[PDB]
Amino acid sequence: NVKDLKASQRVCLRSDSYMLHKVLENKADPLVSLMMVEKVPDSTYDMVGGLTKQIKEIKEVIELPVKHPELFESLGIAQPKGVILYGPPGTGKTLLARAVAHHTDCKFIRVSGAELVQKYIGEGSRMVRELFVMAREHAPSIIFMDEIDSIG
Amino acid sequence: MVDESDKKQQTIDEQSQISPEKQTPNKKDKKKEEEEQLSEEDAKLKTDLELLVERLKEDDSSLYEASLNALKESIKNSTSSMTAVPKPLKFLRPTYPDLCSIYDKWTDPNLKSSLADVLSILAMTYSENGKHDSLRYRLLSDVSDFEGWGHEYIRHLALEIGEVYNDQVEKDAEDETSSDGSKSDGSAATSGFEFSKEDTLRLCLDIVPYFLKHNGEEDAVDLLLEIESIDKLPQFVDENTFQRVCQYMVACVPLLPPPEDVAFLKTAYSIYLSQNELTDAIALAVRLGEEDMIRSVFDATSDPVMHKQLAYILAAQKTSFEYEGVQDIIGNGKLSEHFLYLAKELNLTGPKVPEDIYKSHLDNSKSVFSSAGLDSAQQNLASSFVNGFLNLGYCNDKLIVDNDNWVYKTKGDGMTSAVASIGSIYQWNLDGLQQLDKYLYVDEPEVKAGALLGIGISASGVHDGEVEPALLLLQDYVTNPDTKISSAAILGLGIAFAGSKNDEVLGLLLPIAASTDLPIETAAMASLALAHVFVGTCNGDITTSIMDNFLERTAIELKTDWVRFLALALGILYMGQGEQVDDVLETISAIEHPMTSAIEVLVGSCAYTGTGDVLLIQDLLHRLTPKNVKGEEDAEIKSEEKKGKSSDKDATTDGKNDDEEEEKEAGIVDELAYAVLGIALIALGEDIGKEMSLRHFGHLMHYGNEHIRRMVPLAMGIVSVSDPQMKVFDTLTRFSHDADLEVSMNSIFAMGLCGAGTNNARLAQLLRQLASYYSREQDALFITRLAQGLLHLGKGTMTMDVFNDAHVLNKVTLASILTTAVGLVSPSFMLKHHQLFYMLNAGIRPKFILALNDEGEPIKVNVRVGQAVETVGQAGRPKKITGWITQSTPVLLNHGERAELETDEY
């Protein structure tokens, strides 16, 4: 009935005139589309390890306010915003952000500056609000917007 | 961190982060050898404290917990607590953080249960020494902040909160409670409360009320007085100390039901009397409803001074704020007694000076005329009343009125109510008498009667001091045998005096409202008047009014409408208190018939007032009984049924309104949603029930003083055209009026469409016309608030004639009541030493921010506006005095209040 039904839920039909039968036991998330076509498996800190310092640096501002936002309320700090990772390519800059995310249980959303990850809106400008809204559906999340600036 | 060995001060802290070598081994072995080493253990106590002090910085639990874990053991294992009983007792000071560190910083069922009990017994016994008090204090103001103590310090104080609360719930109290061990009063825990209170008043305002409410005595509050009275100005300012005192009382309105609440409000009054503002004393004195406290404050200003000064003017201004005029009677008579200055003070207290300042406001505002003159049939009656509704208050539109053409074409009850509409044009003003005189001396007995109605209305702005009161003129007319003459006199008498009481008024309204033997449908007005006289002060709950209600119901039901008015009159009468309305609910319910159940449901609304959340579920339970009875069968009466149903609908709403002002004021917004859903429920539940509930909704909003006056009347209004009873629009517009031509523009525009567009009876057309013209005045000439103004949590008396009219179906008879709309609000203005008719500056702000008050205070940021503005209603209520830059001092504070300004300049 209408209180077991909500939006974005897949159903099965017996077409007696399109008579709703059951919920479907399958769905493909639209955020998972982006992540699929990218294709990422999980990492930990043995894929970064040997630069032990980096793990500490990012742990303070990224990991903890997902885990306990009560620390940052007591402190009074206004919560962290953008965090720049930069260095030679081959230092596993991407691998550190993967490594935090499995422990924290975030959706590791690697964006790459692509129009190929989408096939459902198909431009990056309109996928800024919406990407946020999907990452809120499936919160917690890490939006790894990897800019490159090779584009054009 | 790691153990490395002690050779400096930094590394001793490191040693004991893993394992103390000074508090654990040493002390323990020592205690179990000889009782001569008790001398040394006292010396080592200070040493143990210092290592705790240093280590309240380690964020995670594990290396503070585990490290002190055997110290927690030493209490019962080696110290024992009975090897001398002074010596183990005085060694409990270091072991007490250790107990909390396994209790709370590790939640484990076996030890958290056990150690709650241990913390209570040893805390109470060791606060006899007074070193347990000091032990909390070094942790209260702590060292450094981290996770651990953010939980720890609440545990220390929770022992105290625990015991006093439990002593009330349980019929066992004392140390028989098994989750404590602390005695209920005694003197071993009494000292713990006294020391704890000093610090927490200084830094917090959190546990301070909690403890008092748990004592439940104005004694407890009077101990608080001693600490605060020093603190009044130097430690924290007068204004801040005031905010504390009103926060307690506002916060503890549900938490102290009426008999408990007034006992606490007596002490809040006393704090205010001692400090600077006697203005806040008066406000709290009205809130109780106590005549006595008012007199004390009048004496406090008057007796030490024999010179006109700000002081005499100040007492008279303070009593003026109550437009109920309970205060106005009290203040008139001490002023005559004192006999220094009669002339300026007696008028100022009375509503006579408020008439004069109105002339100045009216100049800027001007006068709007748009009144209909289009007569011919029923449209004659509509247009003549509409003339008054657009000019309510004190205005002038003389030339249209003296044209007696349209006046005389009215007929029946219309003639009486046509002259009444003329008098409300000159409402709150002594001049205009000449128009009433014409009708009084011409045609049929009906227009004479309507002239009298005008006197009552006009007298609302001049009576107190007993210089031309409504009683003087209208006592004659009651004596006159003609019925129309008597009904008009006593209705207007009731209006003029509102919350004021006097023997001649009271005793006039006494022989009648006791004789129901005579069949008059217009003797409702007899009780209506009596009800107002009582509101505003601790109730008489007069036995006469209950007597006649019962006798009329027995005698007749042939006029269900008369008795229906009478049932409401009791419920309006019983306001002014909530303690006393308990007893009369029991008296009426003794008599039990389905007709008496109707009377009860209204009086239940008033009875539970100011804490009700039980009232609301009960007023839904009444609704189910119709359907319950139907279920049973599946498995003269006309009058009785009708009264049952109508009372219920008015009561459900009336409970919501009454409750929501008195408890806090942020809940006001929520109660609006119930009504919207109530309308939908009532349309599929009963056809007859719908007719009443439409009208009650508009007055739900006006009584409660909602904060959203833009959205809801307009949204209701479109839908309610289809539904029967156009008397709904009239009742929406009493709320909508707010500041005129702010809200009221949308009403005029929307309502003129539905009115012109649809005609479906000339009866229906008349109501729709009346409503638009009410909402507007002339660039916000006056405002209407059902609240007193002084308290916006308080309830007035003048607007209870507005609240009356929605329980009975619409009539030309009802139109006579509806023309009066007293409940006018004064334009806040500065006074000095000569009497000033304007302001200087005000700050305006849409809303408060503060948690401290729910009445709010304006921020010192505001947007600046000039002099000579009428106070503005909800959707913009906060008003500030701006005079600090002009080096002026308010004497009469205003925060969005009705209170008029007086200023002190050196």
Binding site: - | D206, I207, V865, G866
Partner: protein, 391 residues
Amino acid sequence: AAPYAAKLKQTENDLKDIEARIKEKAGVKESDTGLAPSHLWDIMGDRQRLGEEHPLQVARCTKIIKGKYVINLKQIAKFVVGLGERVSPTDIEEGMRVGVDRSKYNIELPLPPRIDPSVTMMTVEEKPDVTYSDVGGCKDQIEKLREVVELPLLSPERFATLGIDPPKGILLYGPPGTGKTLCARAVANRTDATFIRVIGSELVQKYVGEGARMVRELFEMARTKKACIIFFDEIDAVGGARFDDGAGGDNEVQRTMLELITQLDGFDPRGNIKVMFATNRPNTLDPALLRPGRIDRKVEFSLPDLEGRANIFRIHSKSMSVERGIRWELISRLCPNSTGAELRSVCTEAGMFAIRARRKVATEKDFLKAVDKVISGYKKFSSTSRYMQYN
């Protein structure tokens, strides 16, 4: 921390939880329109229901064969169809839509041409009713509009007596802020002629060739309408300059530029379409609408004169609540030569100084303050005597 603080956190989270609960139990629903004067709708609903009388697969004639027609359904599939009993020999035209029956293909009902219109209907709206007693610019410039646009719509009798081909086109060009749109709104009340208003920048589409279709459809449809005015707004984009590139991407836009030349000139002249073109720069116009043969007398709306500003400020202050005895000439003097829109904001800032001053009127003094505010504004910016360079 403090003992009561510990409870504030719990009660806050109970609020968060109960809002979602109230929302979920109320439910989400889809609003559906109604009508109270219909309490019976199955007096004519039952006739439309349950048999075949028929809802029609819409088609369109692609070629008349003389004695049947070839239609393209919108399911694209083509059929020869005849004539039923609602249709005659003369009702069917080229490129006209017709409705046909789904069990057997035959012309059931003739229909208005072309289903492509839906964004030529988002440039059609009904007329703005702004008066001709408050207008922009108090010069002789609007009477020149009244001879080209307005009068041959009112009265073609005078132009048959002259014997001249009635005058149709006009350019509104010159400085910014001069109320060119205010006078075509003013004319929209007065003539009672349907107004069609165009944005030239909505005529460009990513897929080039789409806006070519667009223009043709609007203009021929308008010849079928009678007594209308098309206000070509913001056609500095398409209607601007033309030039050729070597690897550019400007050329796609120029397609619509070219289509504007060829519909206006037609292969016959405009069938009672009076055209106003509003260019906000007299420097962006195609050099084949620059020629005056299709744009007849063209009237420059310029910045106010020193007498014209005094008039404009008097309309604004008769409409404003003031104290008379304020000079409106003085106010024109303090100003440099500047837009007509500055004087339109002197009053509203004088109205905000009313509220601080606690007035119902604006008096002499505070207009001086407002005049200074806008003037220092133009000092801070430009286009105080610019034409976008070169009258």
